[PDB]
Amino acid sequence: SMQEEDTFRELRIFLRNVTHRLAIDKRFRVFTKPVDPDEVPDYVTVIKQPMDLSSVISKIDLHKYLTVKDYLRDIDLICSNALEYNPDRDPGDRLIRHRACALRDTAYAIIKEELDEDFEQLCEEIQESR
Ligand SMILES: [Cl-]
């Protein structure tokens, strides 16, 4: 319905705002762009499903996220990809993993504070009806 299309449009507006707040955080700059195949040639072979905040913005606009769960799955993928690809004890690896975890925790925290549980429940019920 028109009511349902407005629900999903509100979700997209909410998701864009949260995503922008993450993308402008200096700690999360590494997660704002795809990994460069020139700089990191073995990335696309080690990491089967690359994800970054620019790709998240594209997916919002392509209507790929019908619930906050769908969105958080991709946030979680940014984080898990960073932990997998940079698992070592060295300072460069430990810094990216600390940043990955903060990106994840930050997103979860914004959603917990600012996304109404009944709004999310509605999204889930419309989605399940499709
Ligand atoms: Cl840096």
Author numbering: 979 to 1108
Task: Give the published text.
The C and N termini are highly diverse and may comprise additional helices that extend the canonical BRD fold (e.g., the sixth BRD of PB1 has an additional C-terminal helix) or largely extended kinked helices that are present as C- or N-terminal extensions (for instance in TAF1L or ATAD2).
Bromodomains (BRDs) are protein interaction modules that specifically recognize ε-N-lysine acetylation motifs, a key event in the reading process of epigenetic marks. The 61 BRDs in the human genome cluster into eight families based on structure/sequence similarity. Despite large sequence variations, all BRD modules share a conserved fold that comprises a left-handed bundle of four α helices (αZ, αA, αB, αC), linked by loop regions of variable length (ZA and BC loops), which line the Kac binding site and determine binding specificity. The four helices form a deep cavity that is extended by the two loop regions (ZA and BC loops), creating a largely hydrophobic Kac binding pocket.
